[PDB]
């Protein structure tokens, strides 16, 4: 549909492509967290460890509602188990306790919501493998504290599972203007930054309220708006009536980045590579210049130094070998 070849010749470079997803009413599950482990009712050599754990739990829970050698060893063994129980619990449900309202669920809590069965999780919630990945990296599966009990220590957490409705064939495309030279003068085109393409249909999108994700765009409602016939004609290929303003008395982007690749204007300013300090091979075949990590890991444009990417070595986690 879009004619990117004649758009590239007026400074517009293809950005990240993303498909359109609308968020419906989320499914809800109640994860009841019995915060007291099922200890034995036997009362020998337990003593005050139970009450110490109770006051430790009180310190956690009140702000939520508000807004003899062997005998000691048995106590110590049960003391550490309760701490391990709480530390494991405070890892699966730590963030929810820290922010009782609208905190994103840990991946362990999401797994515990279905007993570790991701095969069930995808089916009952009607998730494709992509939708779960998008929701995870958009941090959209949240949680809320709805009931705290200070007599029998347990808390129930809503875990909101958003329903990502995906458009039939709509892709959100990022259009990145870059300055280009024409008639021995520097120009820049003025087109919407994010576009909606679904078959022959092109519509404006007000993406600002949405969640931008590497694979898709999550929106709470459809933000598509009708296109003018002139703007569609530009995007179809007839760039002769596409907007373009001179760069005089203004600052304009002379480069754009896409999927780790730099598209540059090297006619207006000199572009070099800091790795070697020499100019980049340039041709009149294209009005814009392309640089990738393969050629230069760090390229300079005028005085703008740009890192195209660099993989440094791995490093081991450092800690004392206590055993």
């Amino acid at each position: 549909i879009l004619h990117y070849e004649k758009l590239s010749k007026i400074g517009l470079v293809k950005g990240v492509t993303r498909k359109y997803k609308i968020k419906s009413n989320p499914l809800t599950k109640d994860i009841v967290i019995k915060m007291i482990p099922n200890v034995s009712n036997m009362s020998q050599c337990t003593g005050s460890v139970m009450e110490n754990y109770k006051t430790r739990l009180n310190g956690i829970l009140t702000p939520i509602k508000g807004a003899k050698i062997s005998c000691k060893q048995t106590e110590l063994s049960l003391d550490l188990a309760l701490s391990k129980y709480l530390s494991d619990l405070l890892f699966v449900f730590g963030p929810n306790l820290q922010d009782p309202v609208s905190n994103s669920m840990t991946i362990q809590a999401i797994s515990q919501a279905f007993g570790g069965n991701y095969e069930t999780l995808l089916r009952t919630l009607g998730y494709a493998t992509e939708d779960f990945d998008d929701l995870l990296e958009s941090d959209s599966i949240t949680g809320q504290i709805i009931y705290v009990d200070l007599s029998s220590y347990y808390i129930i957490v809503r875990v909101y599972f958003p329903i990502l409705t995906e458009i039939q064939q709509a892709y959100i495309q990022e259009l990145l203007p870059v300055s280009f030279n024409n008639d021995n003068s520097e120009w820049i085109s003025i087109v919407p930054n994010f576009i909606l393409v679904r078959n022959t249909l092109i519509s404006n999108i007000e993406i600002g309220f949405c969640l931008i994700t590497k694979r898709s765009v999550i929106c709470n409602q459809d933000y598509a708006t009708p296109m003018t016939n002139n703007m569609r004609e530009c995007l179809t290929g007839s760039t002769e009536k596409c907007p373009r303003e001179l760069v005089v008395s203004s600052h304009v982007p002379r480069f754009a980045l896409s999927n780790g690749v730099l598209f540059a204007n090297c006619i207006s300013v000199t572009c070099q590579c800091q790795t070697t300090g020499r100019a980049i091979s340039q041709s009149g075949e294209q009005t814009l210049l392309m640089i990738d990590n393969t050629t230069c890991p760090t390229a300079v444009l005028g005085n703008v130094i740009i890192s195209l990417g660099k993989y440094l070595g791995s490093v081991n986690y450092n800690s004392e070998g206590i055993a």
Partner: antibody
Amino acid sequence: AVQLQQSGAELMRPGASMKISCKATGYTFSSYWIDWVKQRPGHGLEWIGEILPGSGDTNYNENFKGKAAFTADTSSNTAYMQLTSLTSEDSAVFYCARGGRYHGQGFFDYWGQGTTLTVSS
Amino acid sequence: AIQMTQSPASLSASVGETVTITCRPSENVHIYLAWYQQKQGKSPQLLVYNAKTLADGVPSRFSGSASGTQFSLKINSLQPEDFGSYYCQHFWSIPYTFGGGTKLEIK
């Protein structure tokens, strides 16, 4: 392209300075970098730096920042290099090489005929 | 600075033998690797300037190959004039690092 002739061998005392030359003909001199590469007689080849005659831009090696200084007389198609703080370790052969126009063209198409810098007491 | 590992330091091959010299940079240099031929009393001469492209005037007996880190230069039907020193050089980053050099001997 046709000739990259250098000035002949010369003798200087340690601690002095010297100026090498390279004459290039047969192409557009102002476009191609002239990179100087050093070769001690027994241990291989070593790079010094480069100079772009048409723009005056230069690049240098860390071991040769103070040891080298370039100059490109485009009016006579002659390159140059100044060497300072010469010692016995600076007595080697210095080669002028036609580097490429742009990045990714650091390979050396043509080389100088070869003259020996001789530093001794 | 990038370092260049070139092996072997010396290489012996007879007349009509097929011989190969390889070099490895300490870091990815892309196809940016060149091979030069040096003999006593003469300047090095460009043979293969990119990873796998022969220079102008180079005999077809010379050829090269490129890998992720491995770069090798292969000579087919070795002739007496093919003796001398072979250098492997990168132009990925400043400063450009030459290899250790290989002395080929005609047998």
